[PDB]
Chains A and B, each alone.
Chain A
Amino acid sequence: XXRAX
């Protein structure tokens, strides 16, 4: 992964 796009 959610954080990395």
Chain B
Amino acid sequence: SATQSKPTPVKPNYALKFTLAGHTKAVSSVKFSPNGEWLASSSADKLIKIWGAYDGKFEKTISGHKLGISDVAWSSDSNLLVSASDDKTLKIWDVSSGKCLKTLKGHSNYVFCCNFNPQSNLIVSGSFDESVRIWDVKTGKCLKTLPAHSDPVSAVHFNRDGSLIVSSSYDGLCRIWDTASGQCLKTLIDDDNPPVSFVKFSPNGKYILAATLDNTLKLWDYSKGKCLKTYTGHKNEKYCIFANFSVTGGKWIVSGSEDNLVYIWNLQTKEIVQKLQGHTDVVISTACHPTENIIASAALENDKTIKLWKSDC
């Protein structure tokens, strides 16, 4: 019919726009600045690099850790980074100067994961030492050490008002903690206990997205303690791969994979809607831009690059 029309898309169309080269070892983590201007990457090369979020242009390198870095995170005002290193420290960095403002000492094994709270007066960290620590940004002092888990802590994240922390561990547990007291409010267990390799709150703080080392991502209503959605089809049995909620266009779940692809699922239907091809190693980290339909992905030692992908929806 002459009246036939192009249907509204139900899948995104992310396509490769830039490849960001510069790290000399595996990339561990990429994060967009909350103001949308920048991407920060961390690496096994002991460096943090800053890149333009829209143009992919290298901006600067931030150096000082003695061993490789597993995670980096931005303050709410996009002025600070925190990094988590095998050197058993975190460092707080002034992005504009590249100077280390504070070194957060106390963990007794690799620091693996870190995040600021929304207010950005606190940092939470998780370590191979099985603890979660909460740190004062201003003084760099450890405020609390939580006996969080019985195996390495893979992820830590504050909810949207900073009142809760979620943590995950190789022990197979996800725990929710009260920030102000450090008391455990909930432990999510189910059927089994495969290592939980990643967790974060949904942007509305009502769900948690959790990855397990059995090739599965799950969306949990933690208040009810019930699994609402399961996402499969990717490969994830070995590495602590980040996952994300994409909320700028269609509502997707995004994750890396051990088959060197970025997977995108429809959050509601659980259908794989795109697989992004081009990396030549495990895609360890993905991040979604806060306002534009842009994904950053980063890969391990056979690749060492960051890719920026852009979609119309």
Contact of A4 with B128 in the complex, beta carbons under 8 Å: no
**Interface of A (DSSP majority class):** loop
Contact of B112 with A5 in the complex, beta carbons under 8 Å: no
Contact of A3 with B239 in the complex, beta carbons under 8 Å: yes
Contact of A3 with B238 in the complex, beta carbons under 8 Å: no
- Chain A contacts of B240 at CB under 8 A? 3
What's the Cα separation between A5 and B110 when bound, in Å? 12
Contact of B28 with A5 in the complex, beta carbons under 8 Å: no
Nearest CB of chain B from residue A4's CB, rounded to whole Å: 4
Contact of B112 with A4 in the complex, beta carbons under 8 Å: no
Contact of B238 with A2 in the complex, beta carbons under 8 Å: no
What's the Cα separation between A5 and B27 when bound, in Å? 11
B70 sits at the interface (CB 8 A): yes
With beta carbons under 8 angstroms apart, the residue of B25, B70, B300 that contacts A2 is B70
Nearest CB of chain A from residue B135's CB, rounded to whole Å: 19
In the complex, residue of chain A having the shortest beta-carbon distance to the beta carbon of B197: A3
What's the Cα separation between A2 and B137 when bound, in Å? 24
Contact of A5 with B239 in the complex, beta carbons under 8 Å: yes
Which residues of B282-313 have CB atoms within 8 Å of chain A's CB atoms? Answer: 284, 300-301
- Chain B contacts of A5 at CB under 8 A? 26, 238-239, 300-301
What's the Cα separation between A2 and B112 when bound, in Å? 7
B29 sits at the interface (CB 8 A): yes
B68 sits at the interface (CB 8 A): yes
What's the Cα separation between A2 and B151 when bound, in Å? 14
What's the Cα separation between A5 and B26 when bound, in Å? 9
Which residues of B130-152 have CB atoms within 8 Å of chain A's CB atoms? Answer: 152
Residues on B facing A (Cβ under 8 Å): 25-29, 43-44, 68, 70-71, 86, 110, 112, 128, 152, 238-240, 284, 300-301
